[PDB]
């Protein structure tokens, strides 16, 4: 899905099939380097974007005074009770959680 950069020329490798092998290849233009393609997928074009926000959710949002800290839900693994929640910040009123008491940083969703 992501970009494969060119070796020792450092540009972007275009994908190009090889009809003489019936096997996909990547290829540069400014040099002649190629690569055995092991992916067989050019790109994906997601319409739903049913995105796990938890990848984007940063554990550093735990020392912000302007967020609604609560003690109703304890941590998922650490047993600590200071769970400070917030919005999505983006069709949904979902609240996500972040544990406090640092070197924990875990996040979960109700």
């Amino acid at each position: 899905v992501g970009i494969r950069f060119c070796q020792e020329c450092n540009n972007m490798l275009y994908p190009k099939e090889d009809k003489e092998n019936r096997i996909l290849l990547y290829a540069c233009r400014n040099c002649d380097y190629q690569q055995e393609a092991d992916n067989s997928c050019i790109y994906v074009n997601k319409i739903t974007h049913e995105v796990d926000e938890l990848t984007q959710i940063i554990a550093d949002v735990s020392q912000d005074p302007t967020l609604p800290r609560t003690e109703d839900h304890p941590c998922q693994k650490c047993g600590h009770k200071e769970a400070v929640f917030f919005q999505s910040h983006s069709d949904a009123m979902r609240l996500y959680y972040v544990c406090t008491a640092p070197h924990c940083g875990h996040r979960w969703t109700e």
């Binding site: 099939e17 019936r22 996909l24 067989s40 997928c41 050019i42 790109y43 994906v44 074009n45 997601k46 319409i47 739903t48």
Partner: protein, 96 residues
């Protein structure tokens, strides 16, 4: 509801789950093993694989809500693309 759905300009962006491009020149060895049941079904008794299918594959997924919200048929999607662009776009409908 039949009258209701005949007025909205429904493109295929509204019913698309996601879209990707693979390169599976042999249908018998696609990157997906799950479709290999029904891809073979259109190729056990195949039609119009006459000279050379281009070796690419555009795989579009569809929905569940927006596809029965309007009672849409996999035929009338495939028939309208076949009527929209001719027989030189080998479109294969599958099963809900």
């Amino acid at each position: 509801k039949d009258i209701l759905c005949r007025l909205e300009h429904t493109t295929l962006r509204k019913v698309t789950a996601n879209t990707a491009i693979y390169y599976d020149p042999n249908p018998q060895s696609t990157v997906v093993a799950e479709d290999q049941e029904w891809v073979n079904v259109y190729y056990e008794m195949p039609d119009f694989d006459v000279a050379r299918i281009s070796p690419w594959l555009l795989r579009v997924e569809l929905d569940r809500k927006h596809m029965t919200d309007r009672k849409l048929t996999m035929e009338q999607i495939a028939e309208k693309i076949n009527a929209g662009f001719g027989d030189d776009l080998n479109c294969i409908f599958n099963d809900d």
